[PDB]
Structure 1
């Protein structure tokens, strides 16, 4: 390589992004959501049509942020090896923060469980609450989630191997096996005897599993954008960072479910 040619390229492996309007558009969408939600809670508007609008703009702006990331990684190709390590490291530091949010929810459960309050019964769960039975329906969700970790594993290695019919089929089963988890969890919520308003027991129960429930819906969306990118020849055999972070996300989210299955279901009845 000539000295003249090398000077027509970056001298460092890090990616310099052009100025973008999305960091502030999302910032303005977060104020409208924060300012409209604070009003509808006490009136001052009349109906919940502005909250829906704020959520739609918040989601749509975030889609256009991710729309730019895939363009500069697949068409402009600015993700060198050094850049790819930072993205993986940044996601690993992001899932640790996600775990510690759950760690604050387990602390809230153990506080009222080990020494149950006196306004409740002397026992736990409180008197007159029909808790979810661990063996009938939640056990179906446990087997489903474990099988998701087994079918995304050979979908990952089939992509490395080089055949696309097994890689594409592994995700398709993975997506529909996660949707079944969401629909089955939907069935239990609408058939439960107790509500979020049922004292302290309903608060901790629906905050742990509800936060996981909201995380599973975001997992299916992440799985859905990997099926579009694989079908349209975006993900290559040796460069898929949007797929590696999805496999770590589903494996970490199975460990959290197993912990939520031992203390909220078994140990709490």
Structure 2
């Protein structure tokens, strides 16, 4: 039997499938950039989305249906995702250090000034300010959703989390429209390189946060979350606030200062 309150996982195959799917992505990028084949890359993308869906559905099955989630288990899950958040913080900090080393001392080939000549930077007080307002408003709406969960209100939570997802989708399509109507490209020097890598990785992270929010929404509408044991939604709030903090550093760093 078992007397420890730790969950013993059944032998599960999604480690092997996810690992070889990451092998498929790496080989697909190599085959796309050089030998120009797209089928292996799409096969890998399908393999990750299938493996991730089955892994997280298994976690849902063992959590909210079998009840293997003792308080030590979600304490460990809190520790693990906090560690993952810190890892992503230092990833974006490496990108910020690249931008700061780029813009602190401009070189002779750029002309010795930031911004370089022949580029038109985005004025910060238009629609990037709207993106900051949208992300902050989504943070406030998800805090309303968290307090509606703790207090025990369902329809207030549904309205709050629905408008949180709506502003997340509005933010990412507004950012995509600004990738459309911008006056400089990724081949426009170190300014374009730093700008588009930083904003693109933030865009990938906010669409990951939006997907995690929408699966949290369908889980809530399927009555999975109880009054206090609702760790997936707290995970959504934590990652969403992390994306908000990263965008605040982006808007102060790149968009406003030096432009």
Which bin holds the TM-score, normalised by the shorter protein? over 0.9
Take 2:168 and 2:142, find their aligned partners in 1: how far apart are those partners? 11
Of 25-34 and 100-109, deviating more is 25-34
Task: Report the counterpart of residue 24 of structure 1 in structure 2.
Answer: 16
Q: Deviations over 1:76-130 (max 9, x none)?
A: 1101011110000111111000000011011101111010011112210110111
Ranges in structure 1 where 5+ consecutive residues have no aligned partner: 1-8
Q: How far 1:39 sits from its partner (Å)?
A: 2.0
Take 1:131 and 1:187, find their aligned partners in 2: how far apart are those partners? 16
Take 1:212 and 1:40, find their aligned partners in 2: how far apart are those partners? 24
Take 2:65 and 2:34, find their aligned partners in 1: how far apart are those partners? 48
- What TM-score, normalized to structure 1? 0.93
Superposition RMSD in Å? 1.1
Take 1:34 and 1:141, find their aligned partners in 2: how far apart are those partners? 33
Q: Deviations over 1:196-226 (max 9, x none)?
A: 1111111100111111000010111111011
The 1:150–1:36 alpha-carbon spacing in structure 2 relative to 1, beyond 3 Å, is: closer
Question: SS at 1:34's partner residue?
Answer: helix
Take 2:37 and 2:77, find their aligned partners in 1: how far apart are those partners? 41
Task: Report the counterpart of residue 41 of structure 2 in structure 1.
Answer: 51
Q: Deviations over 1:151-182 (max 9, x none)?
A: 11111111111121101111000000110000
> Computing the radius of gyration over CA atoms, which structure comes out larger, 1 or 2?
1
Take 2:27 and 2:137, find their aligned partners in 1: how far apart are those partners? 43
Number of residue-to-residue matches in the alignment = 259
Is residue 215 of structure 2 the alignment partner of residue 225 of structure 1?
Answer: yes
